[PDB]
Design a protein around this ligand. Structure first.
Ligand SMILES: [Ca+2]
Ligand SMILES: [Ca+2]
Lengths: 153, 167
């Protein structure tokens, strides 16, 4: 008999209501030591089935571009629910991908990468779409504030 | 109670005059960062350093900041001005909010910074704090954060008098 794990992932900063579906979706969730993975939907919901029933202890690897990656340990078998829509697992934005690579720390390095793209927009040479962290159509003080809020890993 | 104000030292002008604009905060409790957008007509007014006359370009900061200048809290100042669209776009923000909070003392009242305007053309014009592409969802093109990184809201934005040509 196999194990199914589900839950909700979200963020802790303010954003425009129309970006909710884009902010909550696309978090990768993977069962460590397996190729069992999924992405969150528009409400931040994820589900992974077919975990071996004998695998009573596993780790969920949660990640997204520009977010501080997170390991959540789960103990149990059968139908498991690791978080709820009201108390979701929070991931912190601000571990900025730099030439394809994040360093698992939220730092002045991250702050400066945002500062680099401050005031940029689609079509600008330096514009990076996913550094508009709150997805409001601008890279400005609020995107910098999000990084500083989380100013350590 | 609280406000961000844009002041002009002169509003009745002839060509060749230099108008000094000052951005000020009032009763902005717990403020740790600010972004302001000043909109002007670049055909009529040229943005300049009010002491040297040097024209502002993309990176030029507002001159003589008073608030948010504590060295110990690691101030971060930047500007991406759009001189051709007539937008001054300045932001300043502390990075060490924990040290600032621990002090208990709020940089609530004082000068954000200054920018001069050389009169180029004999025409009625306006200089305003105004939302631009840089600042969606803002308070009249102002964005303020507190020392927890949350937006400060509920303040008024004070506009200078419209500018008239001395005839
Ligand atoms: Ca980092
Ligand atoms: Ca943004």
């Amino acid at each position: 008999d196999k194990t199914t794990v589900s839950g909700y992932i979200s963020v802790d900063f303010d954003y425009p209501p129309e970006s909710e579906s884009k902010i909550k979706s696309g978090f990768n969730v993977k069962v460590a030591g397996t190729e069992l993975s999924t992405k969150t939907d528009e409400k931040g919901y994820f589900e992974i089935s077919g975990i071996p029933g004998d695998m009573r202890e596993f780790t969920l690897e949660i990640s997204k571009r520009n977010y501080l990656k997170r390991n959540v340990t789960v103990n149990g078998t059968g139908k498991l629910v690791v978080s709820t829509e009201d108390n979701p697992l929070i991931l912190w934005a601000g571990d900025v991908e730099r030439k394809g690579v994040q360093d698992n720390a939220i730092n002045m390095v991250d702050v400066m990468e945002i500062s680099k793209v401050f005031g940029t927009r689609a079509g600008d040479e330096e514009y990076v779409a996913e550094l508009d962290l709150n997805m409001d159509g601008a890279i400005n003080l609020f995107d910098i504030a999000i990084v500083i809020r989380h100013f350590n890993a | 109670s609280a406000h961000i104000a844009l002041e002009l030292d002169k509003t009745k002008v002839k060509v060749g005059d230099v108008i000094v604009a000052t951005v000020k905060a009032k009763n902005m409790t717990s403020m740790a960062g600010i972004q302001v957008n000043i909109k002007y007509d670049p055909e009529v007014l040229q943005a300049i350093d009010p002491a040297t006359g040097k024209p502002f370009t993309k990176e030029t900061l507002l001159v003589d900041p008073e608030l948010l200048s504590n060295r110990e809290y690691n101030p971060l100042l930047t500007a991406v001005n759009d001189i051709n669209s007539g937008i001054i776009n300045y932001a300043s923000c502390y990075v060490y909010w924990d040290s600032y909070r621990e002090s208990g003392v709020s940089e609530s009242t004082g000068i954000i910074g200054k920018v001069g305007f050389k009169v180029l053309k004999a025409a009625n014009t306006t200089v305003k704090l105004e939302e631009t592409r840089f600042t969606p969802n803002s308070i009249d093109g102002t964005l303020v954060i507190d020392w927890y990184g949350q937006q400060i809201v509920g303040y008024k934005v004070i506009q200078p008098d419209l500018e008239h040509h001395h005839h």
